[PDB]
Amino acid sequence: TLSILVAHDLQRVIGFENQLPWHLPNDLKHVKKLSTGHTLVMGRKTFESIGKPLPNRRNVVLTSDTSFNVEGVDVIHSIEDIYQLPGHVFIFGGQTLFEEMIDKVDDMYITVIEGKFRGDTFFPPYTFEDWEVASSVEGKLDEKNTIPHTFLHLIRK
C-alpha cells in the first residue's frame, strides 16, 4: 500500500520557512496513529526541517547525497527504490516529492486546514473527479486545537 500523508491549508500551503505554519495537536496524533509501525518516506529538506527521525516507524529519506547518514534513518537515492519498500508506505513530504508521487500513490490521507496561511511550500493541485472520498471527518476544536480542520481519506478512482 502506497499512500500520501499531508496537511495543507485552503490554498494547499504545507510549509513556511522550514516550519509548519500552524500548530494542530490533533493532526500530530492523526499522523502518529496512521504511521506508527509503518514507513514514512520524505525528501531531504523535509527531513532536515524535522531534524530527527520519528519514533516507532521506519524513516526513509530520499537524497542524492551519497554521504548522507543519520542514526535511525534509511537512505534511498532513487524514486524507484520507494517501490521496493515493504509494507504500508506513506509519502510524507515535501512539495518536490509530492509532485513526483501524487500520480503514483493508491490513496491520500489529507488534513485540510480551513485557513489561509502564508507559505512557500505547496501541495500539488488535484481534482475530486480523480479521487473518491472514502471518509471525511471534522476535527474537534478546543483548548489546543483552534483552527478548523478535516481528515480526508481519498482513494484513486
Ligand X SMILES: NC(=O)C1=CN2[C@@H]3O[C@H](COP(=O)(O)OP(=O)(O)OC[C@H]4O[C@@H](n5cnc6c(N)ncnc65)[C@H](OP(=O)(O)O)[C@@H]4O)[C@@H](O)[C@H]3O[C@@H]2CC1
Q: How many residues contact ligand X, by CB under 6 A?
A: 24
Q: Which does 27 bind (CB under 5 to 8 A by kind): ligand X, ligand 06U, none?
A: ligand 06U
Where does this chain bind ligand 06U (CB under 6 A)?
5-7, 19-20, 27-28, 30-31, 46, 49-50, 54, 92-93, 111
What is the C-alpha separation between 19 and 27, in angstroms, rounded?
15
Q: Which does 58 bind (CB under 5 to 8 A by kind): ligand 06U, ligand X, none?
A: none
- String marking each residue 117-146 x if it binds ligand X according to CB under 6 A: ----x-------------------------
Short-list 111, 94, 105, 104, CA closest to 45: 94
Question: Quick check: 53 binds ligand X (CB under 6 A)?
Answer: no
What's at 36, amino acid-wise?
Answer: T
**CB burial readout 86-115, b (16+ within 10 A) else e:** eeebbbbbbbebbeebbeebebbbbbbbee
